[PDB]
Amino acid sequence: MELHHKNDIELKKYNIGVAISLGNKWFSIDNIEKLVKWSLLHTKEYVIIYIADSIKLSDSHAEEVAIRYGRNLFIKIKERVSLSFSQDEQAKIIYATWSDIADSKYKEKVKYLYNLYDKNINFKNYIENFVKEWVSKEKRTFNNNEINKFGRYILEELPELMVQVKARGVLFEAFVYPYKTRITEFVGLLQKGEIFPEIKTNILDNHPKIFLEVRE
Superfamily in which the 2-215 domain is placed by CATH? Cyclodipeptide synthase (3.40.50.11710)
Q: How far is CA 183 from CA 14, 26, 150, in A?
A: 22, 16, 14
Q: How far is CA 92 from CA 36, 95, 114, in A?
A: 11, 10, 35
Q: Are 209 and 174 in contact (CB under 8 A)?
A: yes
CA atoms of 14 and 38, how far apart (whole Å): 13
For this PDB entry, the determination method is X-ray
Supply φ then ψ for residue 14, to 5 degrees.
-115, 140
Nearest CA-CA partner of 92 in 150, 34, 41: 41
CB-based contacts of 150, cutoff 8 Å, min separation 6: 55, 131, 142
CA atoms of 175 and 177, how far apart (whole Å): 7
For β-strands 210-215 and 93-96, DSSP reports them as unpaired
CA atoms of 213 and 127, how far apart (whole Å): 24
Q: Is 147 exposed, middle or buried (0-12, 13-18, 19+ CB in 10 A)?
A: middle
Q: Are 124 and 117 in contact (CB under 8 A)?
A: yes
CA atoms of 164 and 158, how far apart (whole Å): 12
Note the resolution in Å, 1 decimal: 2.3
Q: Is 173 exposed, middle or buried (0-12, 13-18, 19+ CB in 10 A)?
A: middle
For β-strands 170-171 and 2-3, DSSP reports them as unpaired
DSSP string covering the chain, please? -EE--HHHHTTT-S-EEEEEETT-TT--HHHHHHHHHHHHHH-SS-EEEEEEE----SS-HHHHHIIIIIHHHHHHHHHHHHHHS-HHHHTTEEEE-HHHH--HHHHHHHHHHHHHHHH-HHHHHHHHHHHHHHHHHSS----HHHHHHHHHHHHHHHHHHHB--EETTEE--EEEESS--HHHHHHHHHHTTSS-HHHHHHH--S-BPEEEEEE-
